[PDB]
């Protein structure tokens, strides 16, 4: 009862409302209760582990050992769970599940000693999962590739990699083989090695792909040339879809700029409706991004997660600004404001071009850096603002008499304040100018020196792993995104809408495998586990404190 | 050969002017033989690599702000050499560093994103590309 999990279980069980009739007041403890607190600790995406009965000799579950490991891990029993993990079923999912549960618990720990050990144990389990995975990958590559995409029926019908992404398993995803898997699924059907410029070259030319100017793995396509199927597999690769999408985006913004510049006119031209319908197709694709999830999570949680997306938040802000400016252009009396409102719309699109350099080798880290630095840029902006308006109202008050000029005094005062801030009257003039060079030209720049040296030096190392971690989700999106450009995404949109009107993830990310194949796979990894363990304890014997004890 | 063309005497001459610039950078080749300065040549040779890809992003930011500034405070005119040159001059004057509310909004955005952020990006990037190499360069 000293642990945090007992208090959380008691707070659930006391708030359990559906137990009306019994001899006592405190009804019972059922397994669906601890399943319910486990689901809220673990995340929304999994199913409930234990089912609720809709109502023998010995009732036996799918596996006892997982629940035993859960019982051991919620109470921070270290050496016990270290023992019983050796008899696991599929240890790679198991150590991930325990590290995620430990990380989700240790943040809410509210104790200055339990949180630290709770974190360190999760780090050790990360190391265990890494160590078994680097063994089984080194045994055979392509078979171990199948291990990640496999759904585990044990852990509530999920696969391990989305669980690791949920756990922020930063040391785990940074392994070479998993990144190679990501690169393999990123480069689509063809071979991986073509570089970047040759992709653009075959992007420019249609019949080059039918000729002998490009690579293919899966040599049936490389030897037997079916150029319809070859072009189909070529367009199926998400690099191609990404490049055509960014090209269509570039053409869309350029034509939007030209039509906004010279073709503004009160009657509707054809071009304004053209860019309007381009944006309309774009926001239908963005709505499709909201309405996909076959994992039946919270629709409120789905909209919160998509609203938690920074780029999606900027996108819907630009949509709201566009639909404000469109009805201001609809008013014939507000033509000059509404037009320049759309000008801001162009700015709210070009910031989307900062979305590119995540795919760069090096620049993505700097995007992470400026995303960090914005957080105190904001609350420094507030203080510089109140300082400069204090100096401005002082400058307005000193060298004039009291006049009620609403547009004469305020505008000239704001112009003088901006001229100051863009960087016998002799004694008072020297005092004003020396104060101006004193507080403005020195202090707050040094505040930014200290604050930004701090917010740089606090993070100037591990960001490469953060970029490697952040690599996944865009590949996830573009595998999910269809292959048509936003001028032609409507053909897919109508087909998907009528398909869901009259009536599923891809198999390359999640698949119910064959059971006898899965048993062979499980026996293989469970054979490799003991091979890991022997050398593990052998090298752990070689620490000098152990030899001192011996 | 531009000086060879008698009709292109003013461009070709100033082309050779750039030639003089392309020779004086060769004088940076000297201070490798210095005791101490050669390391700093190595340092700037390191720093050019992200100077380039920062230059791209500052360029697209300033041209976005420039086309915004062109679009806001004028009517639609087809001036090819009148509007574009004055717009580029106003953008360079900005980047070298009841209209009251809109003027305060434009000037506060100008002091907001330009006068703060990208300099701090260079602070972080160049503190990083300095501190990653600030030791073994003598060897």
Residue numbers in the entry:
A (entry chain B): 528 to 582, 613 to 980, 1020 to 1099, 1104 to 1150
B (entry chain A): 884 to 980, 1020 to 1061
Paste lines from the article:
Intracellular ADPR targets and activates the nonselective, calcium-permeable TRPM2 channel in the presence of Ca2+. Belonging to the transient receptor potential melastatin family (TRPM), TRPM2 shares a characteristic MHR1-4 domain, a transmembrane domain (TMD), and a coiled-coil domain with the other family members. It is unique due to owning a characteristic C-terminal NUDT9-H domain, which has been considered a classic binding site for ADPR and its derivatives, but the presence of the ADPR binding site has not been directly observed. In summary, our human TRPM2 structures defined two distinctive ADPR binding sites, one in the MHR1/2 domain and one in the NUDT9-H domain.
